[PDB]
Design an enzyme around this catalytic site. Structure first.
Site, PDB file in Angstrom:
ATOM      1  N   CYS A  46       0.858  -1.189   0.000  1.00  0.00           N
ATOM      2  CA  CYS A  46       0.000   0.000   0.000  1.00  0.00           C
ATOM      3  C   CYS A  46       0.899   1.245   0.000  1.00  0.00           C
ATOM      4  O   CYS A  46       1.981   1.233   0.613  1.00  0.00           O
ATOM      5  CB  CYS A  46      -0.945   0.007   1.215  1.00  0.00           C
ATOM      6  N   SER A  48       0.624   3.706   1.784  1.00  0.00           N
ATOM      7  CA  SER A  48       0.893   4.130   3.184  1.00  0.00           C
ATOM      8  C   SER A  48       2.110   3.426   3.751  1.00  0.00           C
ATOM      9  O   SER A  48       2.776   4.008   4.618  1.00  0.00           O
ATOM     10  CB  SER A  48      -0.290   3.875   4.063  1.00  0.00           C
ATOM     11  N   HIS A  51       4.783   5.528   2.672  1.00  0.00           N
ATOM     12  CA  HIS A  51       4.803   6.770   3.435  1.00  0.00           C
ATOM     13  C   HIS A  51       5.625   6.580   4.693  1.00  0.00           C
ATOM     14  O   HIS A  51       6.186   7.576   5.207  1.00  0.00           O
ATOM     15  CB  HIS A  51       3.395   7.204   3.816  1.00  0.00           C
ATOM     16  N   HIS A  67       0.452  -3.595   6.523  1.00  0.00           N
ATOM     17  CA  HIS A  67      -0.871  -3.508   7.144  1.00  0.00           C
ATOM     18  C   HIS A  67      -1.993  -4.091   6.308  1.00  0.00           C
ATOM     19  O   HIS A  67      -3.114  -4.153   6.832  1.00  0.00           O
ATOM     20  CB  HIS A  67      -1.194  -2.079   7.563  1.00  0.00           C
ATOM     21  N   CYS A 174      -6.872  -3.444   3.318  1.00  0.00           N
ATOM     22  CA  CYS A 174      -6.699  -1.984   3.228  1.00  0.00           C
ATOM     23  C   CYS A 174      -7.285  -1.425   1.936  1.00  0.00           C
ATOM     24  O   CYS A 174      -8.340  -0.779   1.979  1.00  0.00           O
ATOM     25  CB  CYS A 174      -5.241  -1.532   3.437  1.00  0.00           C
TER      26      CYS A 174
HETATM   27  N1  LIG Z   1      -7.745   6.701   4.390  1.00  0.00           N
HETATM   28  C1  LIG Z   1      -7.283   5.455   4.454  1.00  0.00           C
HETATM   29  O1  LIG Z   1      -7.679   4.622   5.258  1.00  0.00           O
HETATM   30  C2  LIG Z   1      -6.247   5.062   3.466  1.00  0.00           C
HETATM   31  C3  LIG Z   1      -6.107   3.709   3.076  1.00  0.00           C
HETATM   32  C4  LIG Z   1      -5.261   3.348   2.042  1.00  0.00           C
HETATM   33  C5  LIG Z   1      -4.477   4.346   1.446  1.00  0.00           C
HETATM   34  N2  LIG Z   1      -4.553   5.639   1.874  1.00  0.00           N
HETATM   35  C6  LIG Z   1      -3.820   6.694   1.181  1.00  0.00           C
HETATM   36  O2  LIG Z   1      -4.449   6.880  -0.080  1.00  0.00           O
HETATM   37  C7  LIG Z   1      -3.451   7.359  -1.018  1.00  0.00           C
HETATM   38  C8  LIG Z   1      -3.475   6.492  -2.246  1.00  0.00           C
HETATM   39  O3  LIG Z   1      -2.960   5.173  -1.944  1.00  0.00           O
HETATM   40  P1  LIG Z   1      -2.631   4.173  -3.127  1.00  0.00           P
HETATM   41  O4  LIG Z   1      -3.757   4.084  -4.060  1.00  0.00           O
HETATM   42  O5  LIG Z   1      -2.074   2.958  -2.476  1.00  0.00           O
HETATM   43  O6  LIG Z   1      -1.439   5.039  -3.797  1.00  0.00           O
HETATM   44  P2  LIG Z   1      -0.798   5.109  -5.272  1.00  0.00           P
HETATM   45  O7  LIG Z   1      -0.829   3.814  -5.923  1.00  0.00           O
HETATM   46  O8  LIG Z   1       0.508   5.786  -5.080  1.00  0.00           O
HETATM   47  O9  LIG Z   1      -1.801   6.012  -6.083  1.00  0.00           O
HETATM   48  C9  LIG Z   1      -1.745   7.448  -6.042  1.00  0.00           C
HETATM   49  C10 LIG Z   1      -2.001   7.976  -7.467  1.00  0.00           C
HETATM   50  O10 LIG Z   1      -1.960   9.405  -7.347  1.00  0.00           O
HETATM   51  C11 LIG Z   1      -1.434   9.893  -8.570  1.00  0.00           C
HETATM   52  N3  LIG Z   1      -0.973  11.263  -8.374  1.00  0.00           N
HETATM   53  C12 LIG Z   1       0.152  11.692  -7.728  1.00  0.00           C
HETATM   54  N4  LIG Z   1       0.154  13.018  -7.759  1.00  0.00           N
HETATM   55  C13 LIG Z   1      -0.940  13.447  -8.396  1.00  0.00           C
HETATM   56  C14 LIG Z   1      -1.459  14.764  -8.730  1.00  0.00           C
HETATM   57  N5  LIG Z   1      -0.825  15.880  -8.413  1.00  0.00           N
HETATM   58  N6  LIG Z   1      -2.647  14.739  -9.350  1.00  0.00           N
HETATM   59  C15 LIG Z   1      -3.317  13.627  -9.677  1.00  0.00           C
HETATM   60  N7  LIG Z   1      -2.808  12.393  -9.437  1.00  0.00           N
HETATM   61  C16 LIG Z   1      -1.651  12.361  -8.785  1.00  0.00           C
HETATM   62  C17 LIG Z   1      -0.317   8.915  -8.898  1.00  0.00           C
HETATM   63  O11 LIG Z   1       0.128   8.997 -10.249  1.00  0.00           O
HETATM   64  C18 LIG Z   1      -0.945   7.571  -8.498  1.00  0.00           C
HETATM   65  O12 LIG Z   1      -1.504   6.846  -9.570  1.00  0.00           O
HETATM   66  C19 LIG Z   1      -2.130   7.380  -0.277  1.00  0.00           C
HETATM   67  O13 LIG Z   1      -1.871   8.675   0.299  1.00  0.00           O
HETATM   68  C20 LIG Z   1      -2.366   6.410   0.899  1.00  0.00           C
HETATM   69  O14 LIG Z   1      -1.514   6.664   1.980  1.00  0.00           O
HETATM   70  C21 LIG Z   1      -5.436   6.005   2.842  1.00  0.00           C
HETATM   71 ZN   LIG Z   2      -3.150   1.146   3.373  1.00  0.00          ZN
END
Ligand SMILES: NC(=O)c1ccc[n+]([C@@H]2O[C@H](COP(=O)([O-])OP(=O)([O-])OC[C@H]3O[C@@H](n4cnc5c(N)[nH+]cnc54)[C@H](O)[C@@H]3O)[C@@H](O)[C@H]2O)c1
Ligand SMILES: [Zn+2]
Ligand SMILES: NC(=O)c1ccc[n+]([C@@H]2O[C@H](COP(=O)([O-])OP(=O)([O-])OC[C@H]3O[C@@H](n4cnc5c(N)[nH+]cnc54)[C@H](O)[C@@H]3O)[C@@H](O)[C@H]2O)c1
Ligand SMILES: [Zn+2]
Ligand SMILES: [Zn+2]
Ligand SMILES: [Zn+2]
Lengths: 374, 374
Positions: A46, A48, A51, A67, A174
């Site tokens: 993930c 995160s 991160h 996670h 997740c």
């Molecule tokens: N709230 C929760 O419980 C929870 C759970 C899982 C993930 N997250 C978060 O959700 C986010 C996405 O996770 P993921 O899908 O695994 O990540 P990921 O696979 O990195 O997807 C993020 C996407 O954002 C795109 N991106 C980056 N910058 C930009 C921009 N300026 N404009 C438009 N697109 C952009 C990028 O190209 C990528 O495809 C991350 O910050 C995680 O930490 C939160």
């Molecule tokens: Zn996650």
């Protein structure tokens, strides 16, 4: 053959920010009262978890991250009632203690026993079950799934269907549940609505799946990486836009495309600027925007509160708003009955020992989810 | 007789910011197609009118302000179907055109014909019906009720009960409906909940009235002016707190008082800092905060989006979320049927000619609502 004994096994230890994980032997203590020791089978990568590496999500180091996972119970501590040895399980990075005011609330899911708001990197009792090179190693979100064995508190594990394919249903721990629930439960996307999804990674694709399941008429994917658009359309996007292609800011573009603003927007990236853009692009009187992305540690956004005064709703959620222990087994059952698909999220499969290659794939933009097998 | 003729009458003209109103003769043109000319009977002094004076709320000057009022139709333009000469009416500072996407939406009320987002200070046709000393004078929010006569678009007026006491029901034109609806419609306060209300003026007291009508168990009033506390308790506050009395920030105090955060909070002042404090004091997983106060022009707040990611909902609304033309007649009928009280909001009743004295009472902290009578 291991109950009550220390287990030596391999884990991916993060000693330092911005460095590769170290695959090396750790000692995993046996479970104390109301704890469960799990033999891991599969874990997803993930963003995160990344991160943690990048210092976007601050948690104490050194740490065993991970996670999003599934495994098989190896042993249970005294007083455990909800799982038994040999059960398939998903660790719950958002616990469900069942007793706090949030767990008792009909909407609430961010149990007060969570280790996300002010991470300590321990078990519930404030101690660690992990030793490496004779040094204590922190837990991550009570789960620590980048290890052949982990120990979790009972409120941080759910029993799932014995016939579950763990290499798929780990995503229910997740990214799938987060994105799908953010649409269906937190936003409550309506039939015929227009949605905008910012970020087309595993979580954003799961948001799209939820918007489509809810009957949205239009689902606009937004990503700066146009390689993400084909899969987004496969799972329900009606159109995709790259902000880099436009002279005007993308909130203006989306407002024009939606003839005055979208019904539902989702920030699924983790940037302050896209959280404000996503709010702005929803219709000013009745639009809803949901923050899903994890923001950079301790940083504040700036916004004009007139965006809210006109009538917008702004909310966020952890884990798609799902009460974790209630919801995870039901989501697995629904998956088994083909109510949603997980394969679209899985772009790569690797052995656990290739975890660093899995993180390289995420950081390069190539992968959605890599699933690691122990 | 006045129908079809220019009326010369008395009005309170604001020639520039931070000056007293000028009480003098204006000329009021007859109504054009789909317009209504109204003889004013009573108008309240809302803090939003003072924001025009202070430059907190930007609208073209010179202007006839006033938006919380009631009067009697003097004449109608061609094509008017919803009011007739002699009818009691309330001007609607939020129009209800019935045709735009917001008016057609079940939960929208901020009709796209409003003059609040991007104030022009005109009739719908882009022109003014007011002159003073040979100069055109701007309208305010399509209402301009600080005048013996005004002209409004049909979509900015509601017919109300012929037996209505206009010196009371003028408050349904802004402050009562705004506060009450912010509680009952926008927040949807629940029975047994804990509410916190920031700002105990006419609008905040109306929020308390709505929280009590919705069956809140606890309603915590928050004001820096402890003189506001007695009336807040009279209309349903269970306790009042003055942030100036505490060494800790009041969000910490309110979180402690509510054993982990309130169910519903309301910002009813117009300060960026209290908007963030009000969000923060609602429970992090399931709390709801509603912004009611009009913010200072062009100023942005700073906040940590983790406040939302944990599960809070943040929203705002104009006019309590009520679809104005549908709702105002029903609110008047409900008042006539004793479903709520208006007298608790009324501290002063003055002739219109004493408008400046009425504003000085508000600014000094000494009034809730002054009603000006024509
Ligand atoms: N709230 C929760 O419980 C929870 C759970 C899982 C993930 N997250 C978060 O959700 C986010 C996405 O996770 P993921 O899908 O695994 O990540 P990921 O696979 O990195 O997807 C993020 C996407 O954002 C795109 N991106 C980056 N910058 C930009 C921009 N300026 N404009 C438009 N697109 C952009 C990028 O190209 C990528 O495809 C991350 O910050 C995680 O930490 C939160
Ligand atoms: Zn996650
Ligand atoms: N959203 C809408 O449709 C709408 C409608 C009507 C009024 N408003 C706004 O709502 C706000 C309240 O209007 P009103 O009730 O007529 O005003 P008011 O009568 O001036 O009441 C404001 C109250 O806030 C109190 N106050 C001031 N500073 C603080 C502080 N730092 N901490 C706590 N209390 C404080 C003050 O003592 C007073 O009792 C104003 O900003 C209006 O412009 C908005
Ligand atoms: Zn709990
Ligand atoms: Zn309209
Ligand atoms: Zn007002």
């Amino acid at each position: 053959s291991t109950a009550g004994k220390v287990i030596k096994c391999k884990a991916a230890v993060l000693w330092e920010e911005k460095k590769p994980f170290s695959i090396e032997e750790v000692e995993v203590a046996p479970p104390k009262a109301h704890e469960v020791r799990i033999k891991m089978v599969a874990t997803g990568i993930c963003r995160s978890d990344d991160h943690v590496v990048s210092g976007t999500l601050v948690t104490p180091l050194p740490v065993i991250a991970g996670h999003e996972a599934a495994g098989i119970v190896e042993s249970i501590g005294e007083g455990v009632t909800t799982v038994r040895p040999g059960d398939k399980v998903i660790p719950l990075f958002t616990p469900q203690c069942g007793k706090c005011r949030v767990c008792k609330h009909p909407e609430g899911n961010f149990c007060l026993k969570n280790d996300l708001s002010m991470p300590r990197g321990t078990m519930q009792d404030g101690t660690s079950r992990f030793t490496c090179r004779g040094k204590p190693i922190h837990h991550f979100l009570g789960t620590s799934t980048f290890s052949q064995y982990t120990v979790v508190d009972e409120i941080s594990v759910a029993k799932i269907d014995a016939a579950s394919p763990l290499e798929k249903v780990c995503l229910i721990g997740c990214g799938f549940s987060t994105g799908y629930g953010s649409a269906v439960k937190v936003a409550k996307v309506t039939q015929g609505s227009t949605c905008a999804v910012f970020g087309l990674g595993g979580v954003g694709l799961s948001v799209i799946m939820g918007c489509k399941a809810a009957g949205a008429a239009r689902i606009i994917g937004v990503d700066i990486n146009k390689d993400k658009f084909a899969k987004a359309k496969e799972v329900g996007a009606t159109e995709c836009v790259n902000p880099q292609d436009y002279k005007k800011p993308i909130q203006e573009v989306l407002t024009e495309m939606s003839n005055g603003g979208v019904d539902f927007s989702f920030e699924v990236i983790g940037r302050l600027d896209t959280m404000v853009t996503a709010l702005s692009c929803c219709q000013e009187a009745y639009g809803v925007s949901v923050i899903v992305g994890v923001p950079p540690d301790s940083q504040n956004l700036s916004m004009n509160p007139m965006l809210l005064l006109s009538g917008r709703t702004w909310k966020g959620a952890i884990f798609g708003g799902f009460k974790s222990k209630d919801s995870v087994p039901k989501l697995v059952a629904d998956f088994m009955a083909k109510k949603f698909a997980l394969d679209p999220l899985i772009t790569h499969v690797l052995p656990f020992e290739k975890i660093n290659e899995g993180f390289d794939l995420l950081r390069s933009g190539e992968s959605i989810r890599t699933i690691l097998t122990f």
